[PDB]
Amino acid sequence: SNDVRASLYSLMVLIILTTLVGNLIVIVSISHFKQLHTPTNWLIHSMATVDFLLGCLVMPYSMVRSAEHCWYFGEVFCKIHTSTDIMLSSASIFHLSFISIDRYYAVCDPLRYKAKMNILVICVMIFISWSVPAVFAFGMIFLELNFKGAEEIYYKHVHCRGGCSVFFSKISGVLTFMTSFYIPGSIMLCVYYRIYLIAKEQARLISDANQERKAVKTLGIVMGVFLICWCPFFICTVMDPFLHYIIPPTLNDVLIWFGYLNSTFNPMVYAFFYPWFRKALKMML
């Protein structure tokens, strides 16, 4: 029916507007303030920029492809589309992992923080997170490295989903999972678990000296957002090739849109959650 199509259009419009406005606000606020030019704030700014590019030049073209279950224009544009989505999502993940490492050095080693996390190393972090995803994203997609075989499977699966789609083979899918959702996730988990233990012991010391919840809530929020958004997509896409590719396309649509919702929710956990940023923003108002 047309009612569900109109509802989908409205929901996707809301999502795209939300991500655009949030990322733009973060970019402009972090862009010009002398009181906040800390290198970690440069990392947050890079997060916001890559999310803004994802929201502007990738979202709207897949907005209608899933809406009508068909592709308007083929040729070579969808090639750069599927090579840009990979690059931008991977850059976002790498930026999250680097933020976790920076916070780990911020808490576990408190008095050698600024002799190690200077602007030189943060620039290296931004360069790596911008360069490593892009090289592979363009190489694999252009050099026909995504499937490396299973041509019949590729052709029948792509045609079913609307004309052009992301396809993964067995070895390629295994490498993708291991390299993109195993090191970042494990690094984030270990770092934030250690920080939770340290904060727990310090809160206990203060409480029984002057005679927990905040750390639980914050690490909850962060890990819940990241896992709820990305984990289903990667788990399903790594199990599917070993299950003879029996999966309706609607699941794939919803999984990609969960990744997009991660891109939308990202600048609220890391920039709209802390009092100093909201203080600066209200000082502007």
Ligand X SMILES: CCc1[nH]nc(C(=O)Nc2ccc([C@H]3CNCCO3)cc2)c1C
Q: Provide the binding-site residues for other proteins, judged by CB under 8 A.
A: 34-35, 103, 106-107, 110-115, 118, 195, 198-199, 202-203, 206, 210, 214-215, 217-219, 273-274, 276
Candidate list 153, 158, 166, 261; residue touching ligand X; CB under 6 A: 166
159 vs 217, which CB is nearer to other proteins? 217
CA distance readout (Å), 119 to 47, 48, 53, 128, 129 = 16, 18, 24, 14, 15
- 179 near ligand X, rule: CB under 6 A: yes
Rounded Cα distance between 257 and 240, Å, is 18
Per-residue contact string for residues 23-62; x = within reach of ligand X by CB under 6 A: ----------------------------------------
Which residue, among 184, 192, 254, has the nearest Cα to 223 in the 3D structure? 192
51 assigned ligand-binding residue: no
Residue 90, contacted partner among other proteins, ligand X, none, CB below 5-8 A by kind: ligand X
Which residue, among 194, 161, 193, 185, has the nearest Cα to 262 in the 3D structure? 185
Which range of residues in 175-183, 214-222, 243-251, 269-277 is near ligand X by CB under 6 A? Answer: 175-183
- 264 near ligand X, rule: CB under 6 A: no
The answer to whether the beta carbons of residues 168 and 255 sit under 8 Å apart is no
- 259 near ligand X, rule: CB under 6 A: yes
Candidate list 256, 262, 267, 270; residue touching ligand X; CB under 6 A: 256
Sequence-distant contacts of 198-201: CB under 8 A, at least 24 apart: 198/107, 198/108, 199/107
Rounded Cα distance between 39 and 262, Å, is 24
User: What number of other Cβ atoms are within 10 A of residue 141's Cβ?
Assistant: 20
- 165 near ligand X, rule: CB under 6 A: no
Rounded Cα distance between 82 and 61, Å, is 11
Residue 179, contacted partner among other proteins, ligand X, none, CB below 5-8 A by kind: ligand X
Binding-site annotation: residue ranges: 85
Binding-site annotation: residue ranges for 2-phenylethylamine: 85
